[model samples]
Target: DKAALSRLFTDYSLEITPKDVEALENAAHMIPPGTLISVTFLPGAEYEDRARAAKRIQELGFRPVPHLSARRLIDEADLRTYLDMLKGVIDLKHVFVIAGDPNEPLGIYEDALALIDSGILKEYGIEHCGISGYPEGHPDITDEKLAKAMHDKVASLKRQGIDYSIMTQFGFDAEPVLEWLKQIRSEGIDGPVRIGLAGPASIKTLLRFAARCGVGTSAKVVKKYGLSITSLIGSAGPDPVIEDLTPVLGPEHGQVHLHFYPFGGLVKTNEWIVNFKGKQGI
Candidate 1:
C-alpha cells in the first residue's frame, strides 16, 4: 500500500504566487529540483512579477509554468510582450491556460479554447500546455457543455501538435475524483490527468477556498475529510484521500498523478510533503 501511495508523488506539481518567490528561494532544498512550479495570474499581480517569478524558478532548477488568463489579457500585443520578457530569462516552453474569472472579454480571447486556437502559444515556442479539468463539475456550466468544451480544447491541441495534460480542481473526496477519471478515460481523453489534491491546510482556509471555488461543504462532506463540522480550526492533510485514491487507480486509469494546491502555505507544505514521502518509505 505504501508503494502504491508513494507512486502518486513521483513527479508531483505545485502552484505558487509571485510573492512566494523569496520563500521558494529560501526553502530551495526542500523542493526537489526540476519539478514543475506554476506561477499564478492573480488580480493584483503585475506582469513583471510573473516574469520575475518564472525566471527565479528557472534559476532555482525548476520548470516555470506561467499562467495566461484569457480574460485578464488585454490584447495580443500584451501577451507578446509578457512572453518576450519570459523568453529573455527561461526556455518559455510550458504554460497553463484558463478562461479566467471576469465576465466580459478583456480583448478577443473568450476561453481556453480560443486561446489555444489563437496560435500565440505555438508562435512563442510553448510546446507543453496545461488545461483545466473539473471532477465535481462547474457551478455555472452544464455537463454536456463542459464535455463539449473539454473535447474541443483537446482536439485543438492535437491539431496544433501540442503536448498537454488535464489538471483538475481539488476535491474533498476521492470517490468523485476517481469516478471522473474513469469517465474521462472511457470518453477517450487518455493523456496525463493531474489530480488536484489539497496539501495540509487549516480548516478555515479550506472552508473559505471551498466556498470561493463553489465546492459545497455539507456536514457529510466536511466530516468525510476527517474534519469536525463545528470545530473548523487547525489543519488536515490528504492522507485519507490518498489512501482511497492510490489502491483504486489501475491501468484503466492510465497516466494519473497528483498536483498540490498549497494556498500560499508553501514552506509548511514542503515540510509535510517531504515528511509524507519519507513516511511512505522514501
Candidate 2:
C-alpha cells in the first residue's frame, strides 16, 4: 500500500491558466522542480498572458505545456503566430491539445485532429503532445466518437513519430476513470496517462464545476466522495477517489500518474499533496 500510494503520486502534474500565474509564482517552491504544469489557452484568453504564463512556468523550473485548442483558432496562421510567440518566450517543446469547447469551428481546424493533421506541431519543434481523454464521456461528443478519436490520435501521433500521452478530464469518480483506463489499454493505446482530479475545494465550488462539466454525481458517488447535498458549503479533497484507485492499479494501467485541476488554490493543492504524501512516510 505504501508503494502503491507513492507510485500513484509520483510525477504528478498541475493545470494553470493565464490568470493563475500569480498563484503559481507564489507557490513555486512548494511543488517539485520538474513537474509538468500546463497553461490554458482558452478562447478569449489573451495571447500575451498565455505566453507570459508559459515563460513564468519555465522560469520557475517546471516543464511548461501550453494548452492549445483547435476550433478557437481562425486559421493555421493564427496558430503559428501564437506558437511563434510561445517559442520566443519559453522552451516550447510540448503542448496539450484540445478540441475547443465551441460548438462551432472558426474557419479552418475542426478538432484536435485537424490541428494535428495540419502538420504544424512538429514545425514548431513540438516533440511531445498531451492529447485529451474523457473519463466521463463529453456532454457534446458520443463515447463511440471519443473512442474513435482517441484511437485515431494515438495512431497519428505514432505516424508522425511524436511522443504522446493522454490527459483526461477532471472527475470525482474512480470507477469511470479506472474503467476508461481499462478500455484504452485493451485497445492497445498503452501510452502514459495523467488522470485528472480536482484539488481540495469546497462542496459549493466542486458542485459548481461538476454542473458545468456535465460530471455525474449520484447519491452513492456523492456520499463516497464525502459530499453532502445539504451541506454545500463544506469542502473536500480527492482522498476517497485516490484510495479506491491505488489498490486496483497495476502494470495493466501502464505509466499512470496524477494531474490536479487545482480548483481551490495552487498552494492548497500542493499543501494537501505534501500531507497526503506524508502518510506514506517513505
Candidate 3:
C-alpha cells in the first residue's frame, strides 16, 4: 500500500474565493472538516469581502488562512486596520503573505520580506504564515535573487519566533517541484511545504493561467503531462503529475502535502478530489 500518498492526500488544503463565503457551502460534503481553506486576496477585492469569507469558513467548521499581498496594502495603517478587522471578525491566526503579481510596489511594502519586517503580523497573533515558492523559477526574478529572497524570508520568520510554510506556485510538472524541494532540503530549509497543484480545468484555462503566472509549458513538458498544446479544448487534471510523483515521494522530502488551486471550478475540483481518493483507495 502507498501509505505515503494516502497520508499526503488526507491533510491536503485548497485555495478559494474570498469574495463569496457561500462558495464552500455547496461543496461542504466533498471537503473534510478542519481542512485548511486559504482565502485568496485578489487585486481588487474588498476588505469586508475577505473578512466575511474567513468568518464563514470558521462558521462552516474549517480553518481559514487569509492572504495578505504586501504590494496591495496601502500603508502601515492600512495593514494594521485590515488585520485588526480580521482579528475582531474571525479571531484569525494563520495567513498567507505574498509579494503579489504586481510589477511595482503599491505602497510602503515592496515585497513579502518588507511586510514581515514590519512587526505587524506578530502583533496580530499570527501563529503561522505561508510564503510563495517557485520550483521552476520566476519569470521576473533571477534564480539567484529568488534563492536569496527565500533565505531572507525564512531567516526573518525564524528570528521572529513565528511558524511558516512554503506554498509553491502551481505547476504542470512535478519533477521540477520535487527537485526544488530537494534543493530546499539541501540548503537546510526543512519546513512544511504545500506543493501547489491545479485542480481539473480546461486546457485553455490552464494555458491562460500558465502564461499569466509565467509557469513552464514547454512542448516537452506539456506532452509528458498529457496536455496537447495544439488541441486545447478539453480539460486536464493532476493525475499524470501525481502518478509520476508517487514513486519518489517519501519522508526525505520533509512534510509535503498538496495545495489545490481550483481556478474557477471549486465544485468540479472537489468532485475530482473525491474520485482521486476513491481510485487511489486513500
lDDT of each: 0.85, 0.88, 0.86
RMSD of each: 1.4, 1.2, 1.4
Query: What ranking emerges by lDDT with the best candidate at the front?
Result: 2, 3, 1
Model 1, residue 171: distance off in Å is 1.1
Report residue 256 deviation for candidate 1 (angstroms): 0.9
The collision pairs in model 3 are none
lDDT of 2 by residue, 177-281 (tens): 999999999999999999898999988889898887778888998888877868655898998999999999999899999999989888899889988888757
Q: Highest TM-score: give the candidate number.
A: 2
TM-score of each: 0.96, 0.97, 0.96
Count of clashing residue pairs in every prediction: 0, 0, 0
Candidate 2 — number of clashing residue pairs?
0
